[PDB]
Amino acid sequence: MVTVRYYATLRPITKKKEETFNGISKISELLERLKVEYGSEFTKQMYDGNNLFKNVIILVNGNNITSMKGLDTEIKDDDKIDLFPPVAGG
Predict the structure, then answer these.
(1) What residues have CB less than 8 Å from 8, skipping those under 6 apart?
(2) 34: which DSSP letter?
């Protein structure tokens, strides 16, 4: 199982702070999963202006993906993802 943390508008969107997931082993599939599971309400609540994911900040197993991989980023055995609100959001 993989643990995911919410800090951005996603928190008040799902009414939670932490939850587990299964089936996701990559960031690319993870992000797309959030928009689907949470629906458009999440994508819109996060989309401020034009783009959001382009500024979105996600930490994989405690580390920025920008300093490694973009959408092909993978998670470690630890399985831990963090979602924070981008400078464009809010």
Answers:
(1) 46, 83, 84, 85, 86, 89, 90
(2) H
Q: What are phi and psi of 32, to 5 degrees?
A: -60, -30
Q: Which residue in the block uniquely carries the two structure tokens 């470690």?
A: 76
Please answer whether residues 33 and 80 qualify as being in contact, where contact means their C-beta atoms are separated by less than 8 angstroms.
no
CA distance 22 to 1: 5
Per the structure block, which two tokens stand in for 84? 């924070």
All domains in the chain, ordered by first residue:
1-90 (3.10.20.30)
Q: Residue 3 pairs with which residues in a beta bridge?
A: 20, 80
Tokens (6 digits) for 22: 């299964």
Task: Give the count of beta carbons closer than 10 Å to the beta carbon of residue 7.
Answer: 12
Sign of CA dihedral 68, 71, 74, 75: positive
Name the experimental technique. NMR
